[PDB]
Amino acid sequence: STLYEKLGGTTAVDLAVDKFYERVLQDDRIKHFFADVDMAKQRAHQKAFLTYAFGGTDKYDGRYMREAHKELVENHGLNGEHFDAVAEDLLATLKEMGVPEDLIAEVAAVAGAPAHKRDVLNQ
């Protein structure tokens, strides 16, 4: 899988997931969501988040996605502030690696698109 070559190696890829994983638990603001959740699923969820940010989709079909995430919005009171916290954490991880600042802005723009936030937030 030479695709990982772009990342700069597979070792670095796992390093980001491992560190990022702890950031979620470290963040008390969203820890309640992960207070009781199977770590197995989290591995995929967190992995998808990083992958989605590096290359999200302008439009995604699937009411099911909104049905679940929206449920959190009304039941747990999830808002854009929560999303920003998770996304902000990702930016910090990139800084540690030393990725040029120019890319950090572009990377955030990928998910920054409100087109993705609406599906998740379902405002």
Residue 42: both structure tokens together: 């989290």
Query: Is 121 within 8 Å of 73 (Cβ atoms)?
Result: yes
- Measured from the Cβ of residue 94, the count of other Cβ atoms closer than 10 Å reads 17
Query: Is 108 within 8 Å of 74 (Cβ atoms)?
Result: no
Binding interface with ligand HEM (CB under 6 A) = 30, 33, 41, 44-45, 48-49, 52, 68-69, 72, 78, 82-83, 86, 116, 120
Q: Least distance from C-beta 98 to ligand HEM, angstroms?
A: 25
- For ligand HEM, the closer of residues 36 and 102 by Cβ is 36
Instruction: Give the CB-nearest residue to ligand HEM.
Output: 45
The residue type found at 80 is G
Per the annotation, does 116 bind a ligand? Answer: yes
Per the annotation, does 45 bind a ligand? Answer: yes
Binding-site entries for heme: 45, 69, 116
